Coordinates of C-alpha atoms and ligand atoms in Angstrom, one line a residue:
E1 CA 0.1 -0.2 0.2
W2 CA 0.7 3.8 -0.4
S3 CA 0.6 7.1 0.9
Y4 CA 1.6 10.8 1.0
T5 CA 2.4 11.2 4.9
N6 CA 2.8 8.2 6.1
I7 CA 7.1 7.8 6.2
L8 CA 6.7 4.1 5.7
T9 CA 4.8 3.9 2.6
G10 CA 5.7 7.8 1.7
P11 CA 7.0 8.9 -1.6
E12 CA 10.3 8.1 -1.0
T13 CA 9.9 4.4 -0.7
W14 CA 7.7 3.8 -3.9
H15 CA 11.0 3.0 -6.0
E16 CA 11.0 -0.1 -3.5
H17 CA 7.7 -1.1 -3.0
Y18 CA 6.6 -0.7 -6.8
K19 CA 9.7 -1.3 -8.7
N20 CA 8.1 -0.9 -12.1
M21 CA 8.0 1.7 -12.5
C22 CA 8.8 4.1 -9.5
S23 CA 12.6 3.1 -10.0
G24 CA 12.3 4.3 -13.6
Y25 CA 14.4 7.2 -15.3
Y26 CA 11.5 8.8 -16.9
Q27 CA 9.3 9.9 -14.1
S28 CA 7.4 12.8 -12.9
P29 CA 6.6 15.2 -12.0
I30 CA 9.9 17.7 -12.9
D31 CA 10.8 21.1 -12.6
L32 CA 9.9 22.5 -15.8
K33 CA 12.6 25.0 -16.7
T34 CA 12.0 27.6 -19.1
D35 CA 15.7 28.1 -20.1
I36 CA 16.7 24.6 -20.1
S37 CA 13.5 23.7 -22.5
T38 CA 13.5 23.3 -26.4
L39 CA 10.5 25.6 -28.2
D40 CA 9.2 23.5 -30.3
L41 CA 6.9 25.3 -32.8
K42 CA 5.1 22.7 -34.6
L43 CA 3.4 21.7 -31.1
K44 CA -0.3 23.3 -31.7
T45 CA -3.3 24.6 -29.3
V46 CA -4.8 22.2 -27.2
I47 CA -8.8 21.6 -27.9
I48 CA -11.0 20.1 -25.3
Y49 CA -14.3 19.6 -26.6
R50 CA -17.3 17.3 -25.6
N51 CA -19.6 14.6 -27.3
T52 CA -23.2 16.7 -27.2
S53 CA -24.7 13.5 -27.3
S54 CA -23.9 12.2 -24.4
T55 CA -25.8 12.5 -21.5
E56 CA -24.6 10.1 -18.8
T57 CA -24.3 11.5 -15.2
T58 CA -20.6 12.3 -14.0
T59 CA -19.6 11.4 -10.5
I60 CA -16.6 12.2 -7.8
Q61 CA -15.1 10.2 -4.9
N62 CA -12.9 10.5 -2.2
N63 CA -10.8 8.0 -3.0
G64 CA -8.4 8.6 0.0
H65 CA -5.5 10.6 -1.8
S66 CA -7.6 13.3 -3.9
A67 CA -11.0 14.5 -5.2
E68 CA -11.5 12.1 -8.4
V69 CA -13.5 13.3 -11.0
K70 CA -15.2 10.4 -13.2
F71 CA -16.4 11.3 -16.4
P72 CA -18.7 8.7 -18.5
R73 CA -17.3 7.1 -21.4
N74 CA -17.4 8.5 -25.1
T75 CA -18.1 12.4 -23.3
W76 CA -15.4 14.7 -23.3
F77 CA -11.9 14.4 -25.7
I78 CA -8.6 16.1 -26.4
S79 CA -7.7 17.4 -29.9
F80 CA -3.6 18.0 -30.2
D81 CA -3.9 18.4 -34.3
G82 CA -6.9 20.7 -34.7
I83 CA -8.9 17.7 -35.9
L84 CA -12.2 16.6 -33.8
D85 CA -11.6 12.9 -34.2
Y86 CA -11.6 11.7 -30.8
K87 CA -7.9 10.7 -30.9
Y88 CA -7.7 10.9 -26.6
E89 CA -11.3 10.4 -24.9
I90 CA -10.6 11.9 -21.1
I91 CA -11.5 9.8 -18.4
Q92 CA -10.8 11.4 -14.8
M93 CA -9.6 14.9 -13.5
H94 CA -8.4 15.2 -9.9
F95 CA -6.4 17.3 -8.3
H96 CA -3.4 17.8 -5.7
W97 CA -3.2 20.6 -2.9
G98 CA -1.1 22.2 -0.1
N99 CA -1.5 21.8 3.5
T100 CA -0.8 25.7 3.3
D101 CA -1.1 28.3 0.3
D102 CA 2.7 28.2 -0.9
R103 CA 2.6 24.4 -2.0
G104 CA 0.3 21.9 -3.5
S105 CA 1.5 21.2 -6.9
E106 CA 3.1 18.4 -8.4
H107 CA 4.9 20.3 -11.5
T108 CA 7.1 23.7 -10.4
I109 CA 7.5 26.4 -12.4
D110 CA 11.0 27.3 -12.5
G111 CA 10.9 25.9 -9.3
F112 CA 7.7 27.6 -8.2
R113 CA 5.0 25.2 -6.6
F114 CA 1.1 26.7 -7.5
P115 CA -1.3 26.1 -4.4
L116 CA -3.3 23.6 -6.8
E117 CA -2.5 21.2 -9.9
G118 CA -5.4 19.7 -12.0
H119 CA -4.7 16.7 -14.0
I120 CA -7.2 15.8 -16.6
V121 CA -6.3 12.1 -17.6
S122 CA -7.0 11.0 -21.1
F123 CA -6.4 7.8 -23.3
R124 CA -5.0 7.3 -26.4
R125 CA -8.5 6.2 -28.0
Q126 CA -6.7 6.7 -31.5
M127 CA -5.1 3.3 -30.7
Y128 CA -6.5 1.8 -28.0
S129 CA -10.4 0.6 -27.2
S130 CA -11.0 1.3 -23.6
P131 CA -9.1 3.2 -20.6
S132 CA -8.7 -0.4 -19.1
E133 CA -6.9 -1.4 -22.2
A134 CA -4.4 1.7 -22.6
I135 CA -3.8 2.7 -18.4
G136 CA -0.8 -0.1 -18.4
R137 CA 0.5 -0.1 -22.0
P138 CA 2.8 1.6 -23.9
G139 CA 2.1 5.2 -24.9
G140 CA -1.6 5.1 -23.5
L141 CA -2.3 7.9 -21.4
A142 CA -2.0 11.7 -22.1
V143 CA -2.6 13.9 -18.8
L144 CA -3.3 18.1 -19.1
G145 CA -2.0 19.8 -15.8
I146 CA -3.6 22.5 -14.9
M147 CA -2.0 25.1 -12.4
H148 CA -4.0 27.5 -10.4
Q149 CA -3.3 30.5 -8.3
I150 CA -5.0 32.7 -5.2
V151 CA -6.6 35.9 -6.1
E152 CA -8.1 37.7 -3.4
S153 CA -10.8 40.1 -6.0
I154 CA -12.6 38.1 -8.4
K155 CA -16.1 37.2 -9.5
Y156 CA -17.4 33.4 -8.5
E157 CA -17.9 33.4 -13.0
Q158 CA -14.5 34.2 -13.7
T159 CA -12.9 31.6 -11.1
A160 CA -12.5 28.1 -11.9
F161 CA -15.2 26.9 -9.3
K162 CA -17.4 28.5 -12.5
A163 CA -16.1 25.7 -14.7
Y164 CA -16.1 23.2 -11.8
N165 CA -19.9 24.1 -11.0
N166 CA -18.3 24.1 -7.5
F167 CA -18.6 20.4 -7.4
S168 CA -22.0 20.8 -6.7
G169 CA -21.1 21.6 -2.6
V170 CA -19.2 18.1 -2.5
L171 CA -16.3 19.3 -1.2
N172 CA -16.7 19.1 2.9
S173 CA -15.8 17.7 6.2
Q174 CA -18.1 14.9 5.7
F175 CA -17.3 13.5 2.2
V176 CA -15.4 10.5 3.6
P177 CA -13.5 8.2 1.6
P178 CA -14.4 6.4 -0.7
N179 CA -18.1 8.2 -0.8
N180 CA -19.1 9.3 -4.5
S181 CA -21.3 11.2 -5.7
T182 CA -23.3 12.6 -8.9
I183 CA -22.4 15.8 -9.8
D184 CA -23.3 18.5 -12.4
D185 CA -21.0 18.0 -15.3
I186 CA -17.3 20.1 -15.2
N187 CA -17.4 22.1 -18.2
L188 CA -13.5 21.1 -19.2
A189 CA -13.9 23.8 -22.1
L190 CA -14.6 26.5 -20.6
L191 CA -11.8 25.9 -18.0
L192 CA -9.0 25.3 -20.7
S193 CA -10.2 29.0 -22.0
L194 CA -9.3 30.6 -18.6
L195 CA -5.8 29.9 -19.7
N196 CA -3.9 30.1 -22.8
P197 CA -4.2 26.4 -24.5
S198 CA -1.0 27.3 -26.7
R199 CA 1.3 27.9 -24.0
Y200 CA 2.8 25.2 -22.2
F201 CA 5.1 22.5 -21.6
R202 CA 5.4 19.3 -23.1
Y203 CA 7.6 15.9 -21.9
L204 CA 7.1 12.3 -22.1
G205 CA 6.6 11.0 -18.6
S206 CA 4.7 9.0 -15.6
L207 CA 1.9 8.4 -13.6
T208 CA 2.7 10.3 -10.2
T209 CA 1.0 7.6 -8.1
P210 CA 2.2 4.2 -8.0
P211 CA 2.6 2.5 -10.1
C212 CA 4.2 4.9 -11.5
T213 CA 3.6 3.6 -15.3
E214 CA 6.0 5.5 -17.8
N215 CA 3.2 5.9 -20.7
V216 CA 1.8 9.7 -20.2
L217 CA 2.4 12.1 -22.6
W218 CA 2.6 15.3 -20.5
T219 CA 0.9 18.8 -21.4
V220 CA 1.5 21.5 -18.5
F221 CA -0.4 24.4 -19.1
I222 CA 2.4 27.6 -18.1
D223 CA -0.4 30.3 -17.3
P224 CA -2.7 29.1 -14.0
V225 CA -6.2 29.8 -13.7
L226 CA -7.5 31.6 -10.6
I227 CA -9.1 30.5 -7.5
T228 CA -10.2 32.3 -4.3
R229 CA -8.7 30.9 -0.4
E230 CA -12.5 30.3 0.3
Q231 CA -12.6 27.8 -2.8
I232 CA -8.5 26.2 -1.8
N233 CA -10.0 25.7 1.5
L234 CA -12.7 23.7 0.6
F235 CA -10.5 21.0 -0.6
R236 CA -8.4 20.9 2.6
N237 CA -11.8 20.2 4.4
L238 CA -11.7 16.5 2.5
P239 CA -10.3 14.0 5.1
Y240 CA -7.5 11.4 4.0
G241 CA -8.1 8.0 4.0
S242 CA -6.7 5.8 7.0
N243 CA -3.5 4.8 5.2
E244 CA -2.2 8.3 5.6
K245 CA -0.9 9.9 9.1
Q246 CA -2.2 13.2 8.9
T247 CA -6.1 13.4 9.4
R248 CA -7.4 16.7 6.6
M249 CA -6.4 15.4 3.2
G250 CA -3.3 18.0 1.8
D251 CA -0.3 17.7 0.7
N252 CA -0.9 14.9 -1.6
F253 CA 1.9 15.8 -4.4
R254 CA 5.0 13.6 -4.8
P255 CA 8.8 14.9 -4.5
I256 CA 10.0 16.7 -7.8
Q257 CA 11.8 14.0 -10.1
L258 CA 14.4 14.8 -12.4
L259 CA 14.3 15.0 -15.9
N260 CA 17.5 13.0 -16.6
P261 CA 18.8 10.4 -13.6
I262 CA 22.1 9.9 -13.8
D263 CA 21.4 6.3 -14.7
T264 CA 19.4 6.8 -17.8
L265 CA 19.6 5.0 -21.0
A266 CA 18.3 7.9 -23.3
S267 CA 17.7 11.3 -22.2
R268 CA 14.1 12.6 -22.5
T269 CA 14.1 16.3 -23.4
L270 CA 11.3 19.0 -22.3
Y271 CA 9.6 20.7 -24.9
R272 CA 7.6 24.1 -24.9
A273 CA 4.8 25.2 -27.2
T274 CA 3.7 29.1 -28.0
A275 CA 1.1 30.4 -30.0
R276 CA 1.9 30.6 -33.6
Ligands
U3N1 N1 -1.6 12.1 -11.2 S1 -1.6 11.6 -12.3 O1 -2.2 12.3 -13.0 O2 -0.3 11.1 -13.1 C1 -2.5 9.4 -12.2 C2 -1.9 9.0 -11.6 C3 -2.8 7.8 -11.6 C4 -3.8 7.6 -12.5 N2 -4.7 6.6 -12.9 C5 -5.7 5.8 -13.5 SE1 -6.8 6.9 -14.7 N3 -6.1 4.7 -12.8 C6 -7.1 3.8 -13.6 C7 -8.1 4.4 -14.3 C8 -8.9 3.9 -14.8 C9 -9.0 2.3 -14.8 F1 -9.8 1.5 -15.9 C10 -8.3 2.0 -14.2 C11 -7.2 2.6 -13.3 C12 -4.3 8.8 -13.4 C13 -3.3 9.7 -13.5
NAG2 C1 -21.4 10.3 -28.2 O1 -22.2 9.9 -28.1 C2 -23.8 9.2 -28.0 C3 -25.0 8.9 -27.0 O2 -24.0 8.4 -25.8 C4 -22.8 7.6 -28.3 O3 -23.7 6.6 -28.6 C5 -21.3 8.0 -29.4 O4 -20.9 6.7 -29.9 C6 -20.3 8.9 -28.6 N1 -19.4 9.4 -29.4 C7 -18.3 9.1 -29.9 C8 -17.3 9.6 -31.0 O5 -17.7 8.1 -28.7
NAG3 C1 -21.3 28.0 -6.0 O1 -20.5 28.8 -5.0 C2 -19.6 30.1 -4.5 C3 -19.6 30.7 -3.5 O2 -20.8 30.5 -2.7 C4 -21.4 30.9 -5.2 O3 -21.2 32.4 -5.6 C5 -22.0 30.0 -6.2 O4 -23.1 31.3 -6.4 C6 -22.0 28.8 -6.2 N1 -22.9 28.1 -7.8 C7 -23.5 27.7 -8.1 C8 -24.8 28.5 -8.0 O5 -23.6 26.9 -8.2
ZN4 ZN1 -2.8 13.9 -10.3

């Protein structure tokens, strides 16, 4: 078993308890270094889009380590090439945050931590027929990282919580693991429009929880969307699962991994995109 906050099962132990693949050399998260990265003008604007025929419900669960929104199949998609032909299908979105406002994100940008990093997880439907087929297979997944930053003066409608529809009020101290609830759908298109979808880091990496599978195409947007202190504190009301030492959920982020650990057998490169 694993945790964030119990020293015995925490992130420093994952390379031993889950050798495949938390001991690998293409792990995430990393520090996204603007100066070190390679600008690749070929990397296009990201588009998130919905199947307007889909009517099934969205749910959210406290899984003991995060709040995880589970989307119905065949409903939300990502395009990286401008074509709306269902190459990447979104599965779930979950979040990583801090006990305090100066930490929480998994990635850093030039060493800087944000209070809340959201991960929109998709599978390469272009190749694999289902999430369960893709999740353990090479090149199966693509994850979007969305940084959030706290502002003191803002209307609700301009915060990320408008896109999330406040998660239908489920973020509270009574939302105990492993409870799940039906919630209003998340307007992921609106969420993406709150930042610049052309301006992002891109690299090949891993899941950031065990078993840390090295099959994730990462895109991390540089500009954050905006939330309030009230909204970050809602996440902090969730209780951790019983695997954890800490009672309230927070600091559910993995430590930074190197782009190229010294034992790598083929270095990877950190790429960056910007608008045309
Ligand atoms: N933090 S993260 O974004 O790297 C990340 C970590 C773990 C992860 N796992 C998933 Se989606 N597992 C799963 C989903 C569907 C299924 F059929 C079976 C298993 C996704 C993302
Ligand atoms: C869109 O939703 C409909 C209705 O649920 C479904 O039958 C169809 O296959 C979906 N389209 C895609 C491309 O997943
Ligand atoms: C969500 O929460 C905020 C804070 O209370 C509130 O202003 C907003 O009206 C709520 N959104 C709805 C109506 O779902
Ligand atoms: Zn994550």
